Symmetry: C2
Subunit: 277 residues, 2 copies
């Protein structure tokens, strides 16, 4: 049960309670205004308290995708868009300048509201901002942030071999080949995103999808099951053994492991050409 302001690119949702001059609270990393509700109850006799879900969070919703460049660490799109969200909200609720308080990364949003839309600001408070750009030791803090983001990436890719080895239940050499970190930072970033997408959206949905043995028997003349010569004892071979046992569909052993088509391409090709050539 939240209020809505439709803006360019998003439906902005906010809580509103109180009477009196408008006071907008801008949240930090939690992104949502509900964290200000106990404070709003303390203030509602004196201010019209407005607590925002910033457009990428909570009950707010984007109506257009973020630009490709938003993932660039030097992108200014989001912080600028967040600031003009607050300015538009302030103008939709008040014909006079308003009170604004932002905390943590939300106090950085507040700084940009004052920089680019001073006309909407009556008074403003910056609660514990973590901005470093104007500090004498800016580089220390900026480098540390860039390193922590990269640290989380490396720690993610380290779980690759459990991710594929324990879900596909394949041989460790195959699991290793599948989870081997890419050669470059950009390649590793893409690799991590692929792995996380596959985990969320592919492995469970596909491996429990609606296929039955009677679906194979109906066209058994078209089907060959393939087991790698190097991946014996693995779960996917056990699947093919079950299909072969119950339907009579043949298994052909083909060189290599779970990735035999890239591990041993000449031998893989020879077997296929004998099957189908």
């Amino acid at each position: 049960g939240m209020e809505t302001l439709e803006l360019q690119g998003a439906k902005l949702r906010y809580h509103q309670v109180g009477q009196g001059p408008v006071l907008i609270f801008i949240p930090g990393a939690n992104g949502t205004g509900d964290i200000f509700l106990p404070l709003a109850e303390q203030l509602k006799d004196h201010f019209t308290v407005v607590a925002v879900d910033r457009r990428d969070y909570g009950e707010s919703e984007l109506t257009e995708p973020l630009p490709d460049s938003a993932s660039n660490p030097d992108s200014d799109y989001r912080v600028k868009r967040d600031a003009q969200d607050i300015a538009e909200l302030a103008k939709s609720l008040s014909d006079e300048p308003v009170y604004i308080l932002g905390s943590s990364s939300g106090s950085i949003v507040a700084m940009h509201v004052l920089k680019d839309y001073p006309e909407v600001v009556k008074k403003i408070a910056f609660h514990e901002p973590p901005i470093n750009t104007f500090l004498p030791d800016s580089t220390y803090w900026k480098d540390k942030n860039d390193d922590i983001v990269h640290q989380i990436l490396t720690e993610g890719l380290e779980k690759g071999m459990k991710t594929f080895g324990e879900t596909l239940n394949i041989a460790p050499i195959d699991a290793k080949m599948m989870s081997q970190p890419a050669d470059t930072e950009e390649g590793r970033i893409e690799q991590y995103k692929r792995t996380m997408f596959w985990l969320e959206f592919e492995i469970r949905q596909y491996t429990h999808s609606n296929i039955t043995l009677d679906d194979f028997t109906k066209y058994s003349d078209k089907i060959t099951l393939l087991n790698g010569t190097d991946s014996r004892g693995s779960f996917p071979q056990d699947v093919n053994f079950y299909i072969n046992k119950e339907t009579g569909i043949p298994i052909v052993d083909i060189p290599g492991g779970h990735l035999g088509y890239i591990q041993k391409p000449e031998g893989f090709a020879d077997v296929l050409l004998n099957m189908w050539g």
Copy 2:
């Protein structure tokens, strides 16, 4: 330099080399057809080899967002859409049924092509499928997958306190409150996605955004800097000290830590009402 077939919801990209009957390779968890290129070079005298980037991967691109329900573990949207992608590709390249080989989760795509579009299949090969739905011990494997996906979530949230503590450089009690895992599985899933979004798209972009001290001095009469009484020694307070030292803008100490507005809402409110009431 990849071929393109525009379909409903995506631009499907594929590699094509060879002469002769069409043979479509469907990739597994890597999602991209380049993994079949060394094999394609072995086969190109005998088949027209077609190696696909499935629509969510690689050089393929969605032109509409995935449905909300695609994240449901029992969703069939993606595997069905992948299969009709292959069927449409086969019909765009050949007036006769074609050869198809899928590996790993791509062999599950292949099963669905045969189930729903048998007319496009001349022969088909399932290379080491990890499907469990028709196995007698299906539940063991299905439960194990669901548990591994949930394991990766728990392992992610465990890095929350380093994520906020080492980027904001705040007190450990505050970092703990920010990273405390939500009460429910759905709450924890959303929490992890928020944290990963903030890391990628917020922390670096906002903390090094283009604000200078001269931006504060221009409207210094409107600004109050707020430091929590419980977060002394933290980096965000050091930021406010620098601003106060160089601009003269006042600091008000307000009850609580980095999250004082929810930690101590009555005391926080009292200070604000004295500032602004």
